[PDB]
Amino acid sequence: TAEVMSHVTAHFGKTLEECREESGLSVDILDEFKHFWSDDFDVVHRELGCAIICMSNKFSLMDDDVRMHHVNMDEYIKSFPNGQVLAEKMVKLIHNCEKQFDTETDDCTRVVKVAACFKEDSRKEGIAPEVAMVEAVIEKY
Numbered sequence: 001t002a003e004v005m006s007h008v009t010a011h012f013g014k015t016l017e018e019c020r021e022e023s024g025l026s027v028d029i030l031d032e033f034k035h036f037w038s039d040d041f042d043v044v045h046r047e048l049g050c051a052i053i054c055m056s057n058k059f060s061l062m063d064d065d066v067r068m069h070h071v072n073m074d075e076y077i078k079s080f081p082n083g084q085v086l087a088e089k090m091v092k093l094i095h096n097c098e099k100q101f102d103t104e105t106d107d108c109t110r111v112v113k114v115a116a117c118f119k120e121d122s123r124k125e126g127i128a129p130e131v132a133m134v135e136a137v138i139e140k141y
Ligand SMILES: CCCC#C/C=C/CCCCCCCCCO
Pocket: 008, 009, 012, 036, 052, 056, 061, 062, 066, 067, 068, 069, 094, 098, 110, 111, 112, 114, 115, 118
């Protein structure tokens, strides 16, 4: 659901700053990860793809070939409150987008294209949060 997705996003995004230098991602491109979900934020930069790899690797969410690791992704999603309701659909959506961009060999560029596809499909399928819902989770700390 969009609510589970807010919890996932709020945790995943904590690794943004530690990943920023290696990925070449300027604060001008994305200052806080929560803004990935703004209707207004265009998911396009190669460097955002690189950052996504960095952040994913922190939790083993990529396989050997820099595609999602389905079982690690399932376990991660299920580590959040009510995660079981989102896990199946989220892995199926990401994997469907990966297949559409399988001819992109550049890992950073492929990952940002897949990220943009996933964002559009999460909206169509009703699992895309609003930035406010993501903030609400960050603001409980
Ligand atoms: C394999 C991606 C890890 C993840 C995740 C999701 C976190 C919440 C929103 C970010 C979406 C990233 C999609 C990247 C898929 C690239 O193969």
